[PDB]
């Protein structure tokens, strides 16, 4: 599908509000598996279960192992631009 840029805004006491699966060791993309109620991803919209995350704030998430992607995603602060796509 089309690659979309999706902006999420959050404060430092909040998480992104997503669960993810996948990564290089699993041969599958970093995929959103859950959007959690009331948290930034749910409020801001634009991110959906089944979306693959290709990059966040210009940080390429391709070929990352699961834990490396989790670390990168968890570190982004404030204004967080996702590059996402459903395939």
């Amino acid at each position: 599908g089309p690659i979309r840029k999706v902006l999420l805004l959050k404060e430092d006491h909040e998480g992104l509000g997503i669960s993810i699966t996948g990564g290089k060791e699993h041969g599958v993309p970093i995929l959103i598996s859950e959007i959690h109620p009331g948290q930034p991803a749910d409020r801001c919209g634009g991110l959906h279960v089944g979306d693959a995350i290709l990059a966040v704030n210009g940080v390429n998430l391709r070929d990352t192992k699961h834990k490396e992607a989790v670390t990168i995603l968890s570190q982004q602060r404030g204004e967080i631009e996702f590059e996402v796509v459903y395939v």
Binding site: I18, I20, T21, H26, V28, E34, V70
Partner: peptide
């Protein structure tokens, strides 16, 4: 069944 993380 994949390992899942929450962020």
């Amino acid at each position: 069944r994949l390992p899942t993380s929450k962020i």
